[PDB]
Design a protein around this nucleic acid. Structure first.
Lengths: 88, 81, 130, 302
DNA sequence: GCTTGACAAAAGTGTTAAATTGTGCTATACT
DNA sequence: AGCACAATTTAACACTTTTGTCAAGC
């Protein structure tokens, strides 16, 4: 007594996962491939509030205020503009 | 100790903090066990235990000592003066 | 086991038990459980039995319990050692030997009667081949 | 042919940075990071910039990473210098070095050139922490969370400092008192700290038989039982032939001999179309019938 | 032979508090 | 090392639905 569900990985490979009939099938399944797969059924409800990992920009921003950065860029840009024709 | 006495500011160093005696005790406990020289005393009769003591070893390899043999201070066999 | 008791092969020396679960007992096992009314216990038997081919009397017991005193290593809560000893009659098959390197198995043990005996009627103990 | 003597041969190629250079490279990294973010933010804001200035900022980014990689490649010696001290603790040297290089990477991302401290001052923290944190996560075959590795090491020092104070190894109570935890807790901790042994290790001691082949598989089928179990099934089947048809069906379903699944009284009554109470009443009469000596004496031995 | 209701133990189920666990971080200088 | 904090697991408990039982009765 079992119902079969299919899951599609990102690469396109499909996997058959036999479940029991009286239970609720998941929408994503850790497959033999090692990659998450999405059911080809109607739901497929949710992505489960994935959170963004911390990036180098996050670390920089929380020490320099955006004004300090703008001035440093002006320093750098005025430095660049020195070689465009400017000084020789 | 060298790593301990080098890694710090100074004047906080005491002999105890500088020395964990773990390597000393470990080497001794690790010698009596898991060593070819240290062996369980063979004793099914007083003779066996007596000859287990006085047995000599080499890294022909195994032999026992002479009756009147008397080792010298360093460990040079002296035979009877 | 009580001191001075006689123990054969497979007898129980110390009775010990360890937790067990989930049991998930077979249906044919439980049906008898209900018929005879013996509740399936929640723990499995881990009891010390005398090894196969050993027998003797129990000399002494050494019990070490965590309850009172007794520095037993982390995890251990109690220890008991059983000492068994046996008189070993010289048996056919054992090994004898003299101080000159001669050794052999006891091939047979003949009744004192049918033994080569001196004119005294003094039977000889052992017979060595030439 | 050694692997590490090669890595050392390559990192030394780069020239260390003086105090002034660290600041210069650090500037280029922050400028490039913001310039890159500024461009990406405009598309969201639906804004545009001077075409010429836009190409300038685009080059700023390219220049920032060169400083980012140059800054890393210059300080690799620092990672190795700290990695030396942690060898033999259960992690290979190279692993400690790479993990240290990961800390070095974060030191660069979080370094602040405006504070005026030499780079090695702030990099040692991240490099050190990276190596240690790695060991707690990887060094043990059975991974132990960091907080537990932390307490185990503290229990070790408390035990070492207490060892030197009392001239004897302190018991759980002292160790517990000095550490402000229950002795039963320090016992649970000392079990966690155990490290496994090698099955491939040879314990023959004259015979060269490894430890592995000495373990008794306890789940393996007992030869006599699987047969006596098949004989019990047969004995039960025959014993049921004495009961009524409806009667045998109930006892089977209640214990699940036929379908391997026990059933509640309600479930059994639903298949027979009767109340759940009656099902209970049936079982009782048939347990006392099965308790009749004729059917039982055979089963007691089983 | 069977069903009803009262009823208590038992097993689920949802809601919260506690604990465990994982990640970030430490600024003299140190290659 | 050591701590802070967030994220997640585990416990705890109330409360609800089940499941087994009783006495009395159709």
């Amino acid at each position: 007594p079992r119902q079969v569900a299919r899951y599609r990985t990102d690469n396109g490979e499909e996997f058959d996962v036999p479940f029991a009939d009286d239970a609720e099938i998941p929408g994503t399944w850790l497959c033999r491939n090692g990659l998450e797969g999405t059911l080809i059924e109607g739901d497929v409800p949710e992505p489960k509030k994935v959170k963004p990992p911390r990036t180098h920009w996050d670390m920089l921003l929380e020490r320099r205020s955006v004004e300090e950065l703008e001035e440093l860029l002006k320093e750098r840009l005025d430095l660049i503009k020195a070689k465009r024709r400017g000084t020789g | 100790v060298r790593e301990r006495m080098t890694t710090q500011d100074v004047e906080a160093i005491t002999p105890q903090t500088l020395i964990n005696i773990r390597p000393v005790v470990a080497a001794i406990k690790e010698f009596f066990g898991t060593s070819q020289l240290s062996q369980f005393m063979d004793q099914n009769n007083p003779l066996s235990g007596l000859t287990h003591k006085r047995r000599l070893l080499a890294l022909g390899l195994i032999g026992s000592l002479s009756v009147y043999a008397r080792v010298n201070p360093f460990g040079f066999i002296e035979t009877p003066d | 086991v009580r001191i001075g008791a006689e123990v054969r092969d497979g007898d129980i020396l110390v009775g010990k038990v360890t937790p067990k679960g989930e049991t998930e007992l077979t249906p044919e096992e439980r049906l008898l459980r209900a018929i005879f009314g013996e509740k399936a216990r929640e723990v499995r038997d881990t009891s010390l039995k005398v090894p196969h081919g050993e027998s003797g009397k129990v000399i002494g017991i050494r019990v070490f319990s965590r309850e009172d005193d007794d520095e037993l290593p982390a995890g251990v809560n109690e220890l008991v050692r059983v000492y068994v000893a046996q008189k070993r009659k010289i048996s056919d098959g054992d090994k004898l030997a003299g101080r000159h390197g001669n050794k052999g198995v006891i091939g047979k043990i003949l009744p004192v009667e049918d033994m080569p005996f001196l004119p005294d009627g003094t039977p000889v103990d052992i017979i060595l081949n030439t | 042919a050694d692997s590490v003597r090669a890595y050392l041969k390559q990192i030394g190629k780069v020239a260390l940075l003086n105090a002034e250079e660290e600041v210069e490279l650090a500037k280029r990294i922050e400028a490039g990071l913001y310039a890159t973010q500024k461009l990406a933010e405009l598309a969201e804001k639906g804004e545009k910039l001077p075409v010429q200035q836009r190409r300038d900022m685009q080059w700023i980014c390219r220049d920032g990473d060169r400083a980012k990689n140059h800054l890393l490649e210059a300080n690799l010696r620092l990672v190795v210098s700290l990695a030396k001290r942690y060898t033999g603790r259960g992690m290979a040297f190279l692993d400690l070095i790479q993990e240290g290089n990961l800390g070095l990477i974060r030191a660069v991302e979080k370094f602040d050139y405006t504070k005026g401290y030499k780079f090695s001052t702030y990099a040692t923290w991240w490099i050190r922490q990276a190596i240690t944190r790695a060991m707690a996560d990887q060094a043990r075959t059975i991974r132990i969370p960091v907080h537990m590795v932390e307490v185990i090491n503290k229990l070790g020092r408390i035990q070492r400092e207490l060892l030197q104070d009392l001239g004897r190894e302190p018991t759980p109570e002292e160790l517990a008192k000095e550490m402000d935890i229950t002795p039963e807790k320090v016992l649970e901790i000392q079990q966690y700290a155990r490290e496994p042994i090698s099955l491939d290790q040879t314990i023959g001691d004259e015979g060269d038989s490894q430890l592995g082949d000495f373990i008794e598989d306890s789940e393996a089928v007992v030869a006599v039982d699987a047969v006596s179990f098949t004989l019990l099934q047969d004995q039960l089947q025959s014993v049921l032939e004495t009961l009524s048809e409806r009667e045998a069906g109930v006892v089977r379903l209640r214990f699940g001999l036929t379908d391997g699944q026990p059933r509640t009284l309600d479930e059994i009554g639903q298949v027979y179309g009767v109340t759940r109470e009656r099902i209970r009443q049936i079982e009782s009469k048939t347990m006392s019938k099965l308790r009749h000596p004729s059917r039982s004496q055979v089963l007691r031995d089983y």
